[PDB]
């Protein structure tokens, strides 16, 4: 059984940080493969990760046990993946001052057997993990911590038709090219029930086209999570999520959440653009073709001809 350790410093206080891994809502945030995570077992608990998992997106549950006084966070993968035998870790949050944290991350593992050149392949994947885990920490949550980058809305429609309907429509992104008049093609990949690869060619206002991927989660027929993975100059971070709640109608809505990329604002909005004009650009084109695409899912969830 063998046990590793990494570290990193980070410029948030140690409570903070603490909370974002603590609370799964957030890792979508500070871990760029996360897609969505939600409860198996509430209590300890168990947890529902969705991630990309470099090409391949999958799920996963691990356990995990909290620790809030001491900030510390003890996880466990459920179903191992020969040649690992077993699979755990700790989060340990410390304070070194009152802005800025230590944020320490353990693992356990142990090879099937003890297999000797399966257990030194698990060591060099636990630690290129590890080392990549902690670098996106520090860069997204000094990012996400701050909330001139960070922003998230949402708009809404109602519609009068079963939530299965407006949820279908959405959900059947195969076609779009068809109902959307901005999607002149897509290529939606399911390689498993609820998790899609969404692929697809749009044209923008200003005649830019543009070729797309999303990772989305759904779940039958309330809510569909999903990130993108191929990010634009302006965006670091770009996550949304559509709700679709029945009513004693169904109220419809998509939320975004965007961090911001201000190396790039003044590339490609040119000089004198702020962070305050790139928070509009990006959140009226986003908001632009959701409103687009509710409009559309009303009028197609409406019809009884």
Same mark, same amino acid.
């Not at 693992?107 to 670098?135: F, K, Q």
């Not at 060619?201 to 999570?225: L, N």
């Given at each position: 059984?063998?046990?590793?350790?990494? +570290?990193?410093? $980070?410029?948030?206080?140690?409570?903070?940080?603490?909370?974002?891994?603590?609370?799964? =809502?957030?890792?979508?945030?500070?871990?760029?493969?996360?897609?969505?995570?939600?409860?198996?077992?509430?209590?300890?608990?168990?947890?529902?990760?969705?991630?990309?998992?470099?090409?391949?997106?999958?799920?996963?549950?691990?356990?995990?046990?909290?620790?809030?006084?001491?900030?510390?966070?003890?996880?466990?993968?459920? !179903?191992?993946?020969?040649? $690992?035998?077993?699979?755990?870790?700790?989060?340990? $949050?410390?304070?070194?001052?009152?802005?800025?944290?230590?944020?320490?991350?353990?693992?356990? #593992?142990? =090879?099937?057997?003890?297999?000797?050149?399966?257990?030194?392949?698990?060591?060099?994947?636990?630690?290129?993990?590890?080392?990549?885990? &902690?670098? =996106?920490?520090?860069?997204?949550?000094?990012?996400?911590?701050?909330?001139?980058?960070?922003?998230?809305?949402?708009?809404?429609?109602?519609?009068?038709?079963?939530?299965?309907?407006? #949820?279908?429509?959405?959900?059947? =992104?195969?076609?779009?090219?068809?109902?959307?008049?901005?999607?002149?093609?897509? +290529?939606?990949?399911?390689?498993?029930?609820? /998790?899609?690869?969404?692929?697809?060619?749009?044209?923008?206002?200003?005649?830019?086209?543009?070729?797309?991927?999303?990772?989305? !989660?759904?779940?039958?027929?309330?809510?569909?999570? #999903?990130?993108?993975?191929?990010?634009?100059? /302006?965006?670091?971070?770009?996550?949304?999520?559509?709700?679709?709640?029945?009513?004693?109608?169904?109220?419809?809505?998509?939320?975004?959440?965007?961090? &911001?990329?201000?190396?790039?604002?003044? @590339? $490609? /909005?040119?000089?004198?653009?702020? !962070?305050?004009?790139?928070?509009?650009?990006?959140?009226?084109?986003?908001?632009?073709?959701?409103?687009?695409? &509710?409009?559309?899912? @009303? +009028?197609?969830?409406?019809?009884?001809?």
């Amino acid at each position: 059984m063998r046990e590793a350790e990494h +570290d990193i410093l $980070v410029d948030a206080p140690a409570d903070e940080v603490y909370r974002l891994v603590a609370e799964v =809502a957030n890792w979508p945030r500070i871990f760029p493969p996360t897609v969505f995570v939600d409860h198996v077992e509430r209590g300890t608990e168990r947890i529902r990760i969705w991630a990309t998992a470099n090409g391949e997106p999958k799920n996963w549950t691990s356990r995990r046990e909290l620790d809030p006084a001491a900030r510390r966070i003890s996880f466990h993968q459920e !179903v191992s993946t020969p040649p $690992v035998a077993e699979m755990s870790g700790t989060w340990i $949050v410390e304070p070194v001052s009152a802005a800025t944290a230590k944020v320490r991350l353990l693992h356990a #593992y142990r =090879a099937v057997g003890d297999d000797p050149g399966g257990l030194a392949w698990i060591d060099r994947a636990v630690d290129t993990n590890s080392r990549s885990e &902690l670098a =996106a920490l520090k860069h997204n949550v000094e990012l996400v911590t701050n909330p001139e980058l960070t922003f998230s809305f949402t708009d809404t429609v109602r519609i009068d038709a079963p939530a299965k309907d407006v #949820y279908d429509f959405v959900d059947q =992104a195969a076609l779009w090219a068809e109902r959307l008049p901005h999607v002149s093609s897509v +290529d939606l990949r399911e390689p498993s029930p609820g /998790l899609q690869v969404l692929r697809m060619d749009t044209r923008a206002k200003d005649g830019s086209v543009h070729t797309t991927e999303s990772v989305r !989660v759904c779940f039958p027929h309330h809510r569909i999570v #999903y990130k993108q993975t191929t990010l634009p100059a /302006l965006m670091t971070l770009h996550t949304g999520r559509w709700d679709f709640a029945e009513e004693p109608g169904t109220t419809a809505s998509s939320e975004h959440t965007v961090v &911001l990329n201000t190396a790039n604002i003044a @590339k $490609v /909005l040119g000089a004198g653009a702020g !962070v305050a004009e790139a928070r509009e650009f990006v959140r009226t084109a986003l908001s632009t073709n959701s409103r687009a695409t &509710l409009g559309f899912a @009303k +009028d197609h969830a409406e019809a009884r001809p």
